[PDB]
Amino acid sequence: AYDFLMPSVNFFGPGVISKIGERAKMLGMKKPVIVTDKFLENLKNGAVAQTLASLKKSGVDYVVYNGVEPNPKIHNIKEVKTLYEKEDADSIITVGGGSAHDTGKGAGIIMTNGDDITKLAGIETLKNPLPPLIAVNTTAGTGSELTRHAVITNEETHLKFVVVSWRNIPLVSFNDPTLMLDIPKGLTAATGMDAFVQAVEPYVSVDHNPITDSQCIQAIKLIESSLREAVANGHNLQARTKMVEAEMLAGMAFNNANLGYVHAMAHQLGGQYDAPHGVCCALLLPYAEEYNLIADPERFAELARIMGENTDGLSTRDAAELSIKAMKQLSEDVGIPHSIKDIGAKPEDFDLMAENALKDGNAFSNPRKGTKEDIVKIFQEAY
Amino acid sequence: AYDFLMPSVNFFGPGVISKIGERAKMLGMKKPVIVTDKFLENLKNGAVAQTLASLKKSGVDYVVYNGVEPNPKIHNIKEVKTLYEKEDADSIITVGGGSAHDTGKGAGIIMTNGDDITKLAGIETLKNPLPPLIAVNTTAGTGSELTRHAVITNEETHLKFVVVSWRNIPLVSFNDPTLMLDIPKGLTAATGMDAFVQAVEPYVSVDHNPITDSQCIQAIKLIESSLREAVANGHNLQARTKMVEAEMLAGMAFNNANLGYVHAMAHQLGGQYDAPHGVCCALLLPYAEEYNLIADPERFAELARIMGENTDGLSTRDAAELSIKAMKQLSEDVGIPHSIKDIGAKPEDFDLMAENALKDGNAFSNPRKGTKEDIVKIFQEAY
Numbered sequence: 001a002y003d004f005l006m007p008s009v010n011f012f013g014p015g016v017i018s019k020i021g022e023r024a025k026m027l028g029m030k031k032p033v034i035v036t037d038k039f040l041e042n043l044k045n046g047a048v049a050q051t052l053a054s055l056k057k058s059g060v061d062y063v064v065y066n067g068v069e070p071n072p073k074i075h076n077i078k079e080v081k082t083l084y085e086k087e088d089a090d091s092i093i094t095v096g097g098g099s100a101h102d103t104g105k106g107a108g109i110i111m112t113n114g115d116d117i118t119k120l121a122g123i124e125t126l127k128n129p130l131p132p133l134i135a136v137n138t139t140a141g142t143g144s145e146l147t148r149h150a151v152i153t154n155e156e157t158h159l160k161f162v163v164v165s166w167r168n169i170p171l172v173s174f175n176d177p178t179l180m181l182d183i184p185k186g187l188t189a190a191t192g193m194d195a196f197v198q199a200v201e202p203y204v205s206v207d208h209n210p211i212t213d214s215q216c217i218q219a220i221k222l223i224e225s226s227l228r229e230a231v232a233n234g235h236n237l238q239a240r241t242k243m244v245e246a247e248m249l250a251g252m253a254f255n256n257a258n259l260g261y262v263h264a265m266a267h268q269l270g271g272q273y274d275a276p277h278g279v280c281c282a283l284l285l286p287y288a289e290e291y292n293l294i295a296d297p298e299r300f301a302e303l304a305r306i307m308g309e310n311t312d313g314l315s316t317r318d319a320a321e322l323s324i325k326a327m328k329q330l331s332e333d334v335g336i337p338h339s340i341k342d343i344g345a346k347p348e349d350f351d352l353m354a355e356n357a358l359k360d361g362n363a364f365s366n367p368r369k370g371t372k373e374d375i376v377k378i379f380q381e382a383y
Numbered sequence: 384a385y386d387f388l389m390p391s392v393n394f395f396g397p398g399v400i401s402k403i404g405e406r407a408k409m410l411g412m413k414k415p416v417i418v419t420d421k422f423l424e425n426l427k428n429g430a431v432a433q434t435l436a437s438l439k440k441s442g443v444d445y446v447v448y449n450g451v452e453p454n455p456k457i458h459n460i461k462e463v464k465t466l467y468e469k470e471d472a473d474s475i476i477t478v479g480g481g482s483a484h485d486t487g488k489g490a491g492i493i494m495t496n497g498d499d500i501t502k503l504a505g506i507e508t509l510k511n512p513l514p515p516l517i518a519v520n521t522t523a524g525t526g527s528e529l530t531r532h533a534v535i536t537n538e539e540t541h542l543k544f545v546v547v548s549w550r551n552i553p554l555v556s557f558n559d560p561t562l563m564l565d566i567p568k569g570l571t572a573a574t575g576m577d578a579f580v581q582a583v584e585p586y587v588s589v590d591h592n593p594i595t596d597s598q599c600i601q602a603i604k605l606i607e608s609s610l611r612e613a614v615a616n617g618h619n620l621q622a623r624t625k626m627v628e629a630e631m632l633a634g635m636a637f638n639n640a641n642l643g644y645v646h647a648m649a650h651q652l653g654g655q656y657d658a659p660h661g662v663c664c665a666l667l668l669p670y671a672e673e674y675n676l677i678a679d680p681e682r683f684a685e686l687a688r689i690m691g692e693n694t695d696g697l698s699t700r701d702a703a704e705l706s707i708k709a710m711k712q713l714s715e716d717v718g719i720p721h722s723i724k725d726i727g728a729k730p731e732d733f734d735l736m737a738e739n740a741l742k743d744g745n746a747f748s749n750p751r752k753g754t755k756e757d758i759v760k761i762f763q764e765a766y
């Protein structure tokens with residue numbers, strides 16, 4: 001009736017990378033495709049270079065794929081899957097942010113099943129599972145290394161459809177804090193807000209449960225205390241670790257109870273202006289939730305306490321505001337723009353972009369379903 | 384460096400059973416051994432009868448094993464594994480309490496690897512994993528359907544050794560609240576305390592982490608509010624559900640940070656007097672933790688708040704007591720005996736049983752390592 005979908009093994013803390021090399025060995029895998037963006041291939045902090053070697057070190061082969069695109073295309077999947085057909089892979093290893101992992105998952109399902117991303121779009125339509133996937137992740141925000149979602153972009157009506165199948169879930173997650181030093185200010189603030197959005201969205205979600213609620217708060221608790229630190233001293237590993245924790249505890253929950261509107265709205269803005277996922281999420285949250293108050297502000301009371309607001313003066317509805325206050329404040333501390341106008345949207349675009357909220361699968365888990373009116377009026381509120 | 388080990392799919396709420404039949408089908412399995420005790424085979428509330436049929440209903444075979452013994456023996460494993468060699472199994476399904484699941488896991492590992500429970504005892508010594516295991520569980524306490532532990536008993540020195548390998552972890556967990564109506568007063572109080580012990584033990588544990596801490600409290604939060612209910616109105620499903628939640632949220636955490644002494648001590652008493660695991664755990668907890676105070680009573684402050692104690696008057700050490708008070712009170716509400724004397728132990732046995740605490744692997748995760756003296760003095764305190 002209600003399922004809890006998490007990866008079977010998740011490694012954490014420093015060494016987690018090397019240790020997953022060992023676990024990729026002890027799992028009996030030989031020749032995998034590595035899926036990543038440009039930056040990491042080019043760079044060599046943690047890079048791909050330090051992994052490929054660490055991968056060969058515990059006795060295992062390798063072949064990389066550079067050309068991964070932000071907003072993973074149906075083309076990238078075909079390019080990277082065919083790319084390894086020449087080496088006949090058994091495991092897949094994705095290094096990078098969200099955009100990387102979704103592709104790996106794309107190649108994944110299609111590498112086993114009938115090669116057809118949209119035939120495979122919807123809920124759990126696949127019969128076979130993806131080839132053992134190991135998600136080495138470098139962002140502190142998106143939960144994709146654990147998540148059962150791969151969203152693949154496709155340039156026909158420039159559609160963005162969803163493969164929400166369980167047999168996407170990776171076999172092992174790995175989060176080495178050190179691969180996340182790569183994140184510079186701008187990006188740790190972006191992903192760091194994204195994760196946190198992912199945490200409140202399900203915490204108020206229609207389909208939240210004990211487990212969710214639980215992981216969701218501690219995630220925000222960990223963000224309050226450790227986010228701003230990482231944004232200043234990106235080098236501070238201790239905050240870079242607990243931020244990594246947050247991102248997963250957040251993942252755990254948002255995977256199992258979905259998101260509300262903040263994501264449904266911000267998904268549209270992210271691929272109709274190509275504005276970054278995390279910032280368009282941060283800039284929208286306080287208004288998307290200020291709306292959500294009426295239905296369940298009893299829960300924001302927690303969101304607030306988790307923010308470290310002393311709410312024992314306030315009643316339910318009024319405390320729920322102080323949470324919106326602190327949410328909004330936090331973003332202005334990590335240097336997210338305060339209004340949408342800055343990101344460069346336009347009021348003439350609002351009626352169109354809002355119709356597409358009805359279409360985003362994630363929207364159904366909002367605690368309070370809203371008329372075409374009030375949701376456009378949220379975009380105005382966003383201004 | 385730090386791993387998080389949970390099953391890949393866990394179902395919950397009513398229907399979870401039938402739904403796992405579907406998932407056993409959609410996974411492409413044909414002929415499994417079912418592992419259970421007497422009671423459930425004999426009985427037919429949820430029984431095995433309702434499962435075997437529900438299993439055949441989604442197109443899959445079946446063969447049961449009745450003779451599972453409390454404190455699973457090395458003999459039971461051999462009996463049930465050979466039992467299905469005649470039908471050549473592909474999946475395994477265990478229905479029942481902890482004693483059931485440990486056996487299923489035993490058969491499991493040995494059904495793939497060199498048939499040698501103790502050759503396979505220790506940490507992660509196995510190379511291959513167990514045949515896909517699905518743990519339908521009927522107790523509200525032991526986490527075994529998720530846990531990476533199988534402890535197999537063996538009558539040579541009457542040793543009780545541990546197969547603490549990850550490749551034990553089941554492929555799917557299922558918790559249908561309705562299969563837990565079978566639990567009568569005495570047993571829901573026993574397991575219900577056991578789970579809760581499992582929750583504090585890691586919450587103070589040396590190797591606790593954010594995820595642990597998180598799941599651990601909500602587990603106790605859910606126990607406070609819903610345990611006593613289930614013990615009175617065993618028929619009350621709503622409390623029987625949130626109790627089922629607790630038991631796993633507890634599992635999640637105690638699997639990843641181990642336990643302290645309460646378990647290390649109570650394990651000995653459970654197989655040197657054959658007294659029930661849960662009650663010998665409940666009767667010991669307040670004293671095992673009253674000792675633990677000095678090292679970290681800052682955390683009991685939470686345990687307490689999670690108990691619903693208003694602790695904002697008290698300082699760290701004194702609040703930590705009120706938690707011991709409430710822990711002790713809770714057990715006397717669900718009708719656990721207040722002293723060990725009642726269970727029928729003896730002071731002459733104490734020096735012997737205490738030496739065996741040094742041997743219990745779980746003991747190493749106690750926040751405060753204790754001399755042979757103070758731990759025997761805990762048994763006295765237990766009196």
Ligand code: NI
Nearest residue numbers: 142194198263
């Ligand atoms: Ni997101």
Ligand code: NI
Nearest residue numbers: 525577581646
């Ligand atoms: Ni136990």
